[PDB]
Amino acid sequence: HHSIVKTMIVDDSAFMRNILKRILSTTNKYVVIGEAANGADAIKMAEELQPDLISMDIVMPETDGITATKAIKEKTPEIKIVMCTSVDQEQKMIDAVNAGADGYIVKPFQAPKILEQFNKLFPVLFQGP
Amino acid sequence: SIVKTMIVDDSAFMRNILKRILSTTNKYVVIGEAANGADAIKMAEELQPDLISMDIVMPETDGITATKAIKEKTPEIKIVMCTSVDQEQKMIDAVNAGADGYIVKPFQAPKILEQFNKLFPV
Amino acid sequence: GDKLKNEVEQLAPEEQEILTAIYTGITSLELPGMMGMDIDEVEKVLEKLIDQGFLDLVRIRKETDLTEKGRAVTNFIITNF
Amino acid sequence: SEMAVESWSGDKLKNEVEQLAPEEQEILTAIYTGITSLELPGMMGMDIDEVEKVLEKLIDQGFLDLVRIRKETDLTEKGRAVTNFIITNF
Ligand code: BEF
Ligand code: BEF
Ligand SMILES: [Mg+2]
Ligand SMILES: [Mg+2]
């Protein structure tokens, strides 16, 4: 229904993960149900927690975010994954979209832009007055 | 843990206080707001919430009757009274109507969460 | 006794709502978004209620915006995050 | 506009950026994203006065400007009693 979006934040920077938590906390729909510090944990946690949405950094230990995006998507294609990374090279970005990424935000980002990003994948759905 | 939460109070500013407090939590999603009893009973049937913040003194239907109507229509809904009424008799009626918690306003924010977290623990 | 009740009666709804908000624990900072009010107007009401003794100025906090220097530095340091 | 991006070329920036402490780099990244300067101490494990000291340096260091000044106010025992008197209004 999109009134509640189980969200999973994947970034090796704890501070950046904390950034995305303040932003999503003020919203009435995005509930951070998990955090992964590396892509290998991102793969497993998405497997176990089945989030509706994953904010996915790219440059991370153990396994990158594009490899994580792809591996999560061939098990759970229903999961929406939005790359949240500082890599702005258009190639990596083509690679992310080809891996399954539904979104791509470049750090530094402004909070309304990433909610505007997230809200396209999970819009407010009106059934009528 | 996600608690679909419904806020029932005739004071708009008080539903606002209760929403702002539940916003900082990573648990409570306020999915509905009722300004009186009558609307709280049928909205509770609409949304099937996990938790209702229930005032008593309200324009159309009191919170006790609303609680009572919702509880043995939908007993799984945890109902917590949140109110300026401290008279023990009205309290007794709330608990006997089926209420699971009771907050006396004016309240502190950590105690709003303490009733709610007590009914949906981490 | 008489001074307070005239003050309580002269306390407009906005001021009653503020006082109720701080009691609950709502910091004086996120009051404007809760009342649909300008941040500058709410701060003048706070200044009205400290002078009349309903509130005490605990701490003075600054709200800040990045300079173009700031945004340039953030753009540079971002790979650390 | 974009003039500032060019005016702050890489050579000049690194001197001030290497000056900045890791925490101070965190205030800026958070403030950029939109997290208010009222919102950091509860997010950075820092006491509110340390943040305010750090903010005032970044306004002195030139990285920040002072949009407005915010009051942290608590109820006097008068106001605590007033709230308990007007609670029936809500
Ligand atoms: F480390 Be992330 F790709 F910004
Ligand atoms: F509005 Be009162 F707290 F019943
Ligand atoms: Mg990284
Ligand atoms: Mg009432």
Residue numbers in the entry:
A (entry chain B): 1 to 129
B (entry chain A): 3 to 124
C (entry chain F): 268 to 348
D (entry chain C): 259 to 348
The authors write:
We therefore constructed a fusion protein consisting of M. maripaludis CheY and the C-terminal 103 residues of CheF separated by a 20 amino acid linker including a thrombin cleavage site. The interaction interface between CheY-P and CheFCTD involved the three helical bundle at CheFCTD with one molecule contributing α5 and α6 and the other one α8, covering a total of 778 Å2 buried surface area. At CheY-P, the interface mainly involves the regions directly adjacent to the BeF2 binding site, namely α1 and the β3-α4-loop as well as the β4-α5-loop. Comparing CheY-P to its non-activated form revealed that structural rearrangements upon activation mainly occur in the two mentioned loop regions and thus directly adjacent to the interaction interface with CheF. At CheF, conformational changes are mostly limited to helix α8 being kinked towards CheY-P upon binding. Interestingly, the terminal carboxyl-moiety of MmCheF F348 reaches into the phosphorylation site contacting one of the waters coordinating the Mg2+ and MmCheY K107.
CheF forms a twisted homodimer offering two CheY-P binding sites within an elongated C-terminal tail domain.
